Design a protein around this ligand. Sequence first.
Ligand SMILES: Nc1ncnc2c1ncn2[C@@H]1O[C@H](CO)[C@@H](O)[C@H]1O
Length: 316
Amino acid sequence: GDFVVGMVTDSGDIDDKSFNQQVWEGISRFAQENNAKCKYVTASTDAEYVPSLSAFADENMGLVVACGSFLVEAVIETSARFPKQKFLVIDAVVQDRDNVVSAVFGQNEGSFLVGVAAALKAKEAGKSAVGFIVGMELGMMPLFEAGFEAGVKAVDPDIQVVVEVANTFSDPQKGQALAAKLYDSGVNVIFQVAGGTGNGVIKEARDRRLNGQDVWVIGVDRDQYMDGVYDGSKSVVLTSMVKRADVAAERISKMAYDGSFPGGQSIMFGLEDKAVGIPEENPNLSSAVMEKIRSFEEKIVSKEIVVPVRSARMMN
Ligand SMILES: Nc1ncnc2c1ncn2[C@@H]1O[C@H](CO)[C@@H](O)[C@H]1O
């Protein structure tokens, strides 16, 4: 036998180049470094959710990881039935449950940083608009736009953010279509926050550049710089809003493994903890740009600047 961590996805697969991938990599590192084991199951439909989480709980594993906000209901109900099983919910808040720990991220703060990068790049071409494609808007998803918009405005209040919602994290065909719509309108920079769907946005940006259009995309979850290489050397990825869901998974799995599981707590992984932000190295960002970004970053961490949780269009 061994200590086992089981992961349940709510959409797409572990090869999504972003969110599911980060979570699985984290659980995988935990396992490999501690001689433990791990496995996962994919569940695209919500009627598949409770059955997936329950089978894992029934195997009495070390920790069941619910990857994504679509799983919150199934987890609240499943964890009710299986009080002796530990559950970790990634990307949504679950409190008042001793056997549930939830990890959320200060993605508004991280997104502020790539908004600064987006605005500076847009200004370079004399653009007064930048694009934003998000997979869904439920749960904590709005934090991305709220922060992206704040970062853009911190550079130039006259630059407008144009938003498209895909209503799915697993349709790259739709991501590509929404990206073409935005680029066709004149936008030269798009921040994609759409998981698997986002891979279609990155593909459109690569196709566009090859086609002679000076466009850019900003990645998410992972450092997606290499995914954007289009001519052998250069990349269309301006930078990425990295989100260490892998560290969160790895750390909480280790806590469960060691007997220090913080049940009943919803833990925030932020900019200060370096759980969100931009990659260490950014080939497409100048030193001047990096300078401005790090300056904002320090101010947000020190709380000299508080990043909003909802964008202007979503505030009363
Ligand atoms: N398969 C998914 N299920 C739930 N949320 C997702 C999924 N893929 C991406 N996301 C959300 O969109 C963001 C950018 O991909 C992620 O950090 C996460 O918040």
